[PDB]
Amino acid sequence: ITIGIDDAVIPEEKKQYLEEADRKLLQIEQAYEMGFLTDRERYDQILQLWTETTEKVTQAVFKNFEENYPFNPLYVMAQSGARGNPQQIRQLCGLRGLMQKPSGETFEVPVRSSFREGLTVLEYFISSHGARKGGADTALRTADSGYLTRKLVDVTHE
Amino acid sequence: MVQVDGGRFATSDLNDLYRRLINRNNRLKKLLAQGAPEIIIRNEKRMLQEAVDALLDNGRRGAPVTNPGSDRPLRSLTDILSGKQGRFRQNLLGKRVDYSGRSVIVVGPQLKLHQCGLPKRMALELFKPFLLKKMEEKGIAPNVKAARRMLERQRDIKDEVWDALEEVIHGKVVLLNRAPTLHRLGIQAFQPVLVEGQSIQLHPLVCEAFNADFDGDQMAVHVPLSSFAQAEARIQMLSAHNLLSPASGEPLAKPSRDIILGL
Amino acid sequence: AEPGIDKLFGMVDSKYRLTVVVAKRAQQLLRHGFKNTVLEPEERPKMQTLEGLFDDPNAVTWAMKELLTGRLVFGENLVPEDRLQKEMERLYPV
Amino acid sequence: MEIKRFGRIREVIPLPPLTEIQVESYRRALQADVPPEKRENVGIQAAFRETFPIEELVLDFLEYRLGEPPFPQDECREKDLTYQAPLYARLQLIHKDTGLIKEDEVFLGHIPLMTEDGSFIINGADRVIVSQIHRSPGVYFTPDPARPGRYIASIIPLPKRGPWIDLEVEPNGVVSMKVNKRKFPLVLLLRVLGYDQETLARELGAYGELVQGLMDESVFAMRPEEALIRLFTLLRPGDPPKRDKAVAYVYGLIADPRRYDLGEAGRYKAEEKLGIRLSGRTLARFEDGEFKDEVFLPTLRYLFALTAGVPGHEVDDIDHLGNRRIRTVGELMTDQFRVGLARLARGVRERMLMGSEDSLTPAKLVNSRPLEAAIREFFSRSQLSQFKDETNPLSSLRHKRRISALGPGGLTRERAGFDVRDVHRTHYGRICPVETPEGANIGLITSLAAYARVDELGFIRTPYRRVVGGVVTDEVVYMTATEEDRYTIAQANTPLEGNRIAAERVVARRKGEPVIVSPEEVEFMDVSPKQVFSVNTNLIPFLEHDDANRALMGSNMQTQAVPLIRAQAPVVMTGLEERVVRDSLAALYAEEDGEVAKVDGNRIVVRYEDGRLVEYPLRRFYRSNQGTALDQRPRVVVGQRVRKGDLLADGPASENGFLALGQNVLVAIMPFDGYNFEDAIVISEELLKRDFYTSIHIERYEIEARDTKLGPERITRDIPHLSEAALRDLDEEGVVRIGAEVKPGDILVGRTSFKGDVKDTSLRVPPGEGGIVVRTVRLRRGDPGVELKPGVREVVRVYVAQKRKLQVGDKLANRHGNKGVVAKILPVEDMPHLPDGTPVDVILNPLGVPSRMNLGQILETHLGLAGYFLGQRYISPIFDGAKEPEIKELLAQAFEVYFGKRKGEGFGVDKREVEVLRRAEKLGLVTPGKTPEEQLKELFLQGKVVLYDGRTGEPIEGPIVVGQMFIMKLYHMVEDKMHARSTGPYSLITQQPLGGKAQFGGQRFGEMEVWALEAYGAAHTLQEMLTLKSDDIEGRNAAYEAIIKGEDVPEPSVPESFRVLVKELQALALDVQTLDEKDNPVDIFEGLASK
Amino acid sequence: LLMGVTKSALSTKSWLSAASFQNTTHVLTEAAIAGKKDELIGLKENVILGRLIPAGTGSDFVRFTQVVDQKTLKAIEEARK
Amino acid sequence: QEPVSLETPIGDEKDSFYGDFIPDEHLPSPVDAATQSLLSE
Amino acid sequence: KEVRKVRIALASPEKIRSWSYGEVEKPETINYRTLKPERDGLFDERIFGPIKDYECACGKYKRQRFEGKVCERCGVEVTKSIVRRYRMGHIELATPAAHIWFVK
Amino acid sequence: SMARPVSIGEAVGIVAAQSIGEPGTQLTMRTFHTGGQGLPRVIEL
Amino acid sequence: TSDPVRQYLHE
DNA sequence: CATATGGTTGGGTATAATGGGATTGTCTCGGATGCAGG
DNA sequence: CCTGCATCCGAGAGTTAGGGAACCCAACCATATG
Ligand SMILES: Nc1ncnc2c1ncn2[C@@H]1O[C@H](COP(=O)(O)OP(=O)(O)OP(=O)(O)OP(=O)(O)OC[C@H]2O[C@@H](n3cnc4c(N)ncnc43)[C@H](O)[C@@H]2O)[C@@H](O)[C@H]1O
Ligand SMILES: Nc1ccn([C@@H]2O[C@H](COP(=O)(O)CP(=O)(O)OP(=O)(O)O)[C@@H](O)[C@H]2O)c(=O)n1
Ligand SMILES: [Mg+2]
Ligand SMILES: [Mg+2]
Ligand SMILES: [Mg+2]
Ligand SMILES: [Mg+2]
Ligand SMILES: [Zn+2]
C-alpha cells in the first residue's frame, strides 16, 4: 500500500462535466440579458448549477474507482473505513468546489481545480477565508462545549 | 511575608488591604478624639467603609483598589474564594499529586492489551520508596538512608538495583492519563514493562479511547499506592476490562488504521 | 485481561463488592505474611527472577487466585470484627 | 551539484530587505546621524518639540544628541547589561521679566540601541519588539446597528491622545454628540464655534429636514461665551461654572495640541474623506481668544449627505486594510518617550513653583528619572517586547516580521470577535492568509507578506506593474488598499510575449472580486505569486497542491527546526533560501573584492583592494535564547580571491549560503509492522551511524554567593561530609574544571552556608541533564561594568554542552505539515532496500496523506527520486514551477541511468521483479504486452519501484513510492520533557506539590480526572489522590514511613486545603462548623485554634 | 416546574457543591443567612472534604463486606456453639 | 527594597502567579520526618 | 467522631471576638532591621503564635515539654509553630461597617 | 460498558454527563475542510 | 454617587 | 542587676497661597426595574 | 389600579504543559556591654 501522484486518478468525464457547465452558464447569462432573471434568481441558479456539478463529479470519481481501479489506495482506504471520506477524495481527484466569502455568501466562480492539478493563487486565497473561519470556529466553540459538560456534571453528580 | 532565596521579600495583597484598614481606623479614632468638624469625620467614615468593602470584595463597587505604580487590582478574599483560579476549583476539586510523571508517547505494537512501556528512570523515580525497601531487603544497601544516598547520584547506580526495581513492580499497575479527559476512558490502568529510553509505549488499540496519536502527544503516569487502590485499578480500570463504550454499548477497543487495511 | 476475571465478575452481584473483598483479602494476607492462605503448596502464585522461582510478593494476585479456588466465604454481617481479628491473630501469631 | 530551475515568470524587482520594518522605523525614530538643524518633526524630536517650551520662567528645548554606547554588544551580553546610548538635551532658561538666559546641556539617561539584525539587548537578553496592528485614526461613518437607515459618525484620535467623539441623528431629529459618555446637543457646540443661522442654513439646507431638526433658536440666542459656559455645565456637572475654567477645559478637550492629537495618518485620512485642508491636527483652533471649527462642520456635511443618499458618500469597512495601520518599534518607543517627557515636564513645573525664580538652572529643574523609568518599562514589561526566538535564523527573521493585534491598547485574546480574526479581502499581498497560530491566538498574530512595505503613515503597501494599452511596463507602483481598490489588477500568471498580454481573456481582481476582462481594461498586474505569502510560507515547494491547514502547520514548524552539524539544503527548493540566509545576518560575506589572507576556526582575515587588512572574528559555540548552539564555520582558503558579496563563513543551519534546516533522506511510503501507526515514524540506524540529525545544545547554570545575617556565603572547594570522589572535577576555586563530564548528582560549583557550623548549598546537575562543561564565567563585586543586586557578593555561571543524536521520542517534520515522533530505530539489514542493495532511511505511513490532503510531499518525493538518480537539485517556485510532465521527463532520464547502469554490469530482471510486475499488471498499473523493462520504466515514471523486504528477502507485493524527502528535527525533544517525582517541594499556603518540571513538581489531577475516577467508582484511589498524595501532611508522612517500612499506607485525614478554606471563610465573618451525627461540633483543627 | 441545568444546579440543597460550581458569593450569602446544613450526599462535597465518595467501592451497599477462610469460620462457629 | 506581591501575574494568560513558584521551607518533608522517626526508633 | 455535616452561619461580633487571640492595633508587619514581627502588628507572635517550634520570641523557653506556657517576658505561648496558620485575630472598628456581600 | 445489569453503587450521573459532553467537544457544528444548529441547539435545549 | 473625590469636593 | 550608647520618636518652621485626573474593538442571557399605555 | 416593554446590571465564557519627590532639633525608651 502506497500513495503516488498518479494514484489520485482523474476521471475523464469531469472534462465533459466542465464544458457542459461553461455552456449552461452562458445561457443563464442570456437569461440575464433579456430581463427574465433578477439578481437573486441568477445567483441562486448559478449556485445550484455548481452544486449539482460537484455532486455529479463526486459520483463520477467513485464510479471510476469502483469500475476501473478497484484496488486504488485512496478507494481502498475509504471503502475499508481506514481513512478518508468521499469529500476529501473528491477534492484530491475531482474538484475543490464552491467557496464562501468572509461575509458568509458563496462566490460566483468555483474552484475547478483539484489538489492533484494544483490550485491557482486566487483560488488558494479564496479558500483561505473558509480555512480561517473553521479554525476560529473550533477555538471559540470548544469552550462552550466544555462549559456545557461542566454544567451537566454539577447537575447530575449526585 | 516570605524571603525569596535572593533575600528579597514577597507578600500577599491581603497584607496591604489590612494595612489600609488599620491606618484608616486609627486615623478615624484620632479624629474622633479631637472633636473634628462633621465634614472631616464624614469623609473618614466613608473612607473606612470603602476600605472594608475593598478588603472583603475588591472591584465590586467603584474603582478597584490598586497598588501605586500598577494597574493591577488587589486580590480580595472573594477573589481568593471564587473563580476558575479560586480556592474551590483550583485546590479542592483538583490537586497536584505526588508519585506522578509525564512523558512523550510512542506506539507499542508488541505490547499486550494490558501492558504499557514505562521508562526505567521514570519507574525508578516513581517507585522510589518501594525500591528503597526492597534494596534494604536485599544486600544492595545496609539501610534506607544509604540506599537513598546511592540512588541520588546517577554514577553511583549499579546493575542489581534494576533487578530490585523489576521485583518491586511485579503485578502492580499504573494509571495513564491524556489531557483533555473527556470521558472516563481518558484514564486507564496498565501493567508496566520496564523499557530503555525516555518514551512511554502505548498499545495501538487504546489510542482511539484516549484520542491519542504520535506527533508529539504527552501522557501522565500516576501510581496507586495501597492495596485498595491497586485492587480498584486492576479490577475496575484495567484496559483489558474496558472494551465496550459506556455511552453507546459499542466496542471501543477495536481494529483501526493499519489493522483494518491489512485485514 | 486478568485470569478468570469473568468467573469473578459472575461470582458477585456487584463488581465493587468483588473489589472490596479482594482488597480486604490482600490486606489480610499482607498482615499475616501469607501464612493464612487457602492455596495448596503447588497452586501458589510464582514469580521468576534470576535466582529462581519464588513466591509472588503481590498480595492482590494471591487474593484473586484464592477467590478463584472458591474456598473463601464472603458476605454482609458474617462475623464480628473483634472476633475475626482475635481468632485470626491467635491461629497465626504475628 | 547542478541546480535546475523551473518557472516562466520573471521578477522585475527583487525582494526588499526583509528586516526593514524594524530597522527603518527605529532609524527614523532616532535620527541619530542627522544634524540637529536638519532634523524633521518625527520621532523623539517631535516629542521634544511638543512638550517644550515649558511655559509657567520659560524652559525651552534647543537640540538633542546621542552619545556612544558605554559597552559594546558582546560585553552587554556577558555582564547582563542593556546595549544603550546616552541622550543629552541642550536647554535654555529664560526669565520673562529680566531677559537673562541660562543655557545648559543636561544628561537625560539612556536609550536602547537596535542591533544590525533588528533586535535589542535588554539586561543581556536578546529581545524583539513586535509591530502592532490597530484602527487608524480619522473619521469613520458606520451604519447604525439597531435603527436602520441611520448612520453614526466617529472621530478617533491616536490612542491615549484624545476622547472618541460620536455624532448621531436622534429619533426626534436633532443631531447629538457623545463625548466622554455624555450625550448633548451638537448645535450648542457649533454655536461655541461661532456659527450663525445663515451659515448653517446656507451650508446644510441642500439635504432636507435634517438641517431644520438641528436648527434651534434657544441656543442661537445665547452668545458664544454663554454657550461655552452651558457646554461646561452639561459636560462637567457640579464644577462651579467659571469662564476661565470652562475655556481651559474645552480647549484641552478638542483644541489643545498637547492633549488632542490626530496624528499624521488621522490627518491624511480625514483630509481625503472630507476633502478639506487641516492646517494642524486638532479638531478646532483657539485664535484671537476664540474657537475656530476645523472638522466638525465637514463631518456634519458628510453625515447629512450620506443620510440623504447623495452619490459619492459611503460607509467605512472597519476591517479594510486602508482603515487599519501598523505601529512599529519606533512609534511605540516614541509614544513611551513622550509619556516620560510629559512626566518630566510636570516635575519641571512643580520645581519651578516650589523653588526660587532668582537662582534657577536647567539642571535643577529637570529630573530625568521618569523618562528612564518609562523607557525601562517599555523595553522590559511591554507584551510586545518579547524574548527573541532564535532556534534558527529563520525563527528570528520570522519573529521580526510578526504583527500582533494584542498589547497595550490592543485587543484581548478573549475579547476578539470573528471580524478581526478573519482573512479580509484586502489582506491580499499585505498579510499572509496562511501563517498564524493554531490555538486561541488564531487571527490575532499574523505575518507581513514577502513583498509588502509599511509606509510612513503606517499602511501596508503592495507592488504592482503598470499596464498601458495591453502592454506590461517595468514601472512598479506600491499601493495602499484604498488606492488598490480603484483599479483592475490582472493575475501574475497571465501569458506574455515580450511584455504584451497575449491572451484574449484575462483573470483579474476588481475590488477583490474575481472577474474576466480584456487586456485593454487591465491597469495593473501582480509582481509575483510570492507576494501573496510570507517568508516562511514561501519556503514550501508545491504549495499549490497542499491544503491550507497543513501548509499552516508546515510553515509554523519550519521555525522550530534545530541546526544540525551536517545540515543540508533541500533537494527541492523554492529559490528563496539564499535571501533568507543573507538577510538574517547569520552568514559572513566579503564587504569588497579582495583576497583571503588568514583562515581559522575562529577568525578570517581578508585583504581588500584598498590595501586594508580586515579581521572578522567567528561566533563559535554560542548559546541561543533556546539553548541551541550557533556557530560560524569558514568556507574559504588562504590565497583565494573573493568578489563582493561572496560567502566567507556559513552560519547555523546554512549550507554554502543556502538555508539548511534538515537532511535529505531516502523515504518509502508504506506501512511497516505497526511501528509507523498513527503518524509514527520508522528510521534506519544508518542515519545515526553517519551522524545525521545530530545537534548541539548548551545549558547555562547559575549560582550566587551573597551576604547573610549569619555571615557571608563562600564559593569554595572546602566542603564537609563528602569523600574526595565527589570533588575530583572541582578546581581550587570550588568550580568544576573545563572539559569535565558531569552527570546528575555531580557538583558544578561548591558552596557552603552558615547553618545557624556550615552546611552544603552547592550547585548540582539536575536530573536528566549533564554533558561536557565548556565554559565558566565569574562576576564579582567591583568589577568594571558589573552591577550585582545589593547583598550578592558574586555570581558564577557554567555553560555545559550536549551532543544529542536522534532517539525514540524525537519529533521530525517535513515542509508540508507531515509531523511525527520517531517510534522505532531499525538495523540496516531490516530496512526495505532497492534491488541494487541500497536501503531506505525513513518509512512513512500512507494513511497520513488522504485526510490531510497535502499532496505536495508526494510530488516532492517523486522529484527527489529523479534528483537522487540524476545527481542534481531543483528550484520549483510556488504556483509557477515544476509540473507533472517535466517530472515525468526527469524520471525517464533517471530510469535510463538507473537501469542502463544495471544492464552494463550484466544483470537482467530479477524473478521477484517479474512477480511484482505480474501483480502490477493485475493491479492495472502497467499495460499488458510490453517487455519487463518497459513495465519497470512505466512504474518508475509513476514514482514507484520494486522494493525488497530486508527481513525475508521477498519483495513487497506491490510497487512502493520511494524518493528523497527533506526532513527536519524539531526543538520538541523527549530529553527535555521526561519528568517524574516521588516527593519534593510543597506550596506555602495550600501545602500541595509544586508545578512544573523545573520545580521538580507534580502532575495536576484536575476536575475532569476526578470525574473519570468517580465514573470508575474507584473511591479509594480518589481518596489517595486527594489526601495521601497532595496535602494531608500527617497522612503523607505516615504513608512514606509505612512504604519504606514495608507496611501498607494508613487511612487519610482532612486535607489542608479544607482547613485553608475554613480559615478564609472565617475571615469573611462566616461561621463554618463540622458536625457529627448528633449535630455536635467536631474540631478538625485538633485543638490548635481553641482558646 | 422546568428549569435549565444551571438554575437546577444552583438551586440544590447542598451549599458546598453550589458554592464550588458558580455564583459563589450569592450561594454563600444565602446559605449563611439561612444557616444551611450540608448533609454530604453527593460526590463533590465528599471530594471537597477529602472523604470516601458514596459510590463504587465506597457505597454502603458493598463497603461493609467481610471475607474469611473456612478454618477461621469453623473456629468461630465452635466458639459460638 | 520593597516587597513584591505573591499575586504578581506571570505570563499573558490569567493563570500563573508569582507565589506559585515559591516552595515551603518550614514544614518538614516526608523524607525528613521518616528519618527522624526511624532515628527515634 | 466522623464528620457528617457542615453548617455555615452568620458570625456575631461576640463570635468573632471569641475567635481572635488578640487585636491587631498597628499596621506594622516586620521589623526592618531584624526581620521579626512587630508587637501588635499583622504578624505578632503574641497573637498568632511562635515562628519556631516550642520557642518563645526572646528565647527564655527554647525546648519542648512546656506546652501551654505563656512567656512572662514576651507573651508567646510555647506550642507547635503550625498554629500560625490556624489562629485568627481581629480589628475593632471605631464605627460599624456593612458587610458588602449583604449590600451589593 | 459490560452488556450486563448495572451494579449497585455505580455513579451513573457522572457517566451520563461525560457521555453527553464527549462528542460535542469535537463532532459538532475536528478540522473543517473548506470545500464545495448543532451544539447551540443542544445548549438551548 | 461614586467617586468619593467628587463628593468630598462638593461638600 | 546597672548603666551608656544610638536608635527611635515627638515637635517645629509665620509674605501668601483656597474644588482632581482618567476615560474607548464582545456576546449572550436572566432577573430587577422604571415608564408607557390601557 | 393593572399590564407589557424596553433598560440596566451582573455573571459566565474547556483541559494539560511552560512561564518569572524637606530639613532640623531635642527628649526617651531599647538594647548592649560589665
Ligand atoms: N491546547 C491544547 N490542549 C491540549 N493538548 C494539546 C493542546 N495543543 C496541543 N496539544 C497536544 O499536543 C500535541 C502536539 O501538538 P503539535 O501541534 O504537534 O505541537 P504543539 O505542542 O501544539 O506546538 P507547536 O509549536 O507545533 O504549535 P504552534 O507553533 O502552532 O503554536 C505554539 C503554541 O502551542 C501552544 N501549546 C503547545 N503545547 C500546548 C499544550 N500542551 N496546551 C496548550 N497549548 C499548547 C502554546 O501556547 C504555543 O504558543 C497535540 O497533538 C495534542 O496531543
Ligand atoms: N486547543 C486544543 C487543541 C487540541 N486539543 C486536543 O489535541 C488534539 C489534537 O488533534 P489534531 O487537531 O491533531 C486532530 P486529531 O484528533 O488527531 O484528528 P484526525 O486524526 O481525525 O485528523 C485534539 O483532538 C484534542 O484532543 C485540545 O484539547 N485543545
Ligand atoms: Mg490524529
Ligand atoms: Mg497529537
Ligand atoms: Mg499547536
Ligand atoms: Mg496553566
Ligand atoms: Zn520569652
XYZ file of N, CA and C in Angstrom, chain B residues 1 4 8-13 72 75 85 144 148, chain F residues 2-7 9 14-15 17-18 31 38:
78
model
N 4.555 36.605 54.404
C 5.581 37.582 54.057
C 6.871 36.777 54.124
N 12.490 35.483 49.632
C 12.914 34.672 48.497
C 14.373 34.283 48.694
N 15.124 39.026 48.863
C 14.007 39.945 48.717
C 12.766 39.333 49.375
N 11.729 40.146 49.558
C 10.511 39.697 50.215
C 9.326 39.679 49.257
N 8.445 38.702 49.461
C 7.194 38.575 48.731
C 6.039 38.466 49.718
N 4.949 39.173 49.419
C 3.823 39.308 50.333
C 2.509 39.206 49.568
N 1.437 38.946 50.311
C 0.094 38.865 49.755
C -0.576 40.235 49.779
N -1.516 40.441 48.849
C -2.246 41.707 48.797
C -3.095 41.918 50.045
N -2.944 46.845 38.494
C -3.494 45.569 38.930
C -4.354 45.736 40.174
N -5.994 41.604 45.275
C -6.784 40.378 45.317
C -7.430 40.253 46.692
N -9.582 30.342 39.002
C -8.342 30.299 39.763
C -8.570 30.331 41.268
N 17.941 2.298 54.638
C 17.197 3.142 53.702
C 17.947 4.434 53.398
N 19.148 5.712 49.775
C 18.743 6.976 49.169
C 19.952 7.742 48.654
N 11.483 47.205 48.565
C 10.107 46.935 48.946
C 9.698 45.529 48.524
N 8.846 44.876 49.308
C 8.414 43.520 48.955
C 7.557 43.506 47.699
N 7.598 42.378 47.002
C 6.792 42.173 45.814
C 5.550 41.374 46.190
N 4.567 41.364 45.299
C 3.304 40.700 45.582
C 3.409 39.216 45.254
N 2.837 38.382 46.125
C 2.730 36.960 45.823
C 1.763 36.692 44.679
N 0.934 37.674 44.328
C -0.079 37.543 43.294
C 0.313 38.255 42.003
N 1.107 38.597 38.369
C 0.795 37.686 37.260
C 2.036 37.361 36.442
N -4.256 34.517 32.329
C -4.554 34.776 33.740
C -4.629 33.458 34.513
N -3.469 32.812 34.649
C -3.423 31.512 35.316
C -2.207 31.293 36.205
N 0.611 32.820 38.981
C 1.009 33.864 39.913
C 2.432 33.615 40.401
N 3.050 34.681 40.918
C 4.415 34.586 41.428
C 4.528 33.559 42.551
N 10.447 12.742 53.731
C 11.733 12.080 53.935
C 12.337 12.481 55.275
N 12.599 7.048 62.256
C 13.500 5.900 62.287
C 14.647 6.134 63.260
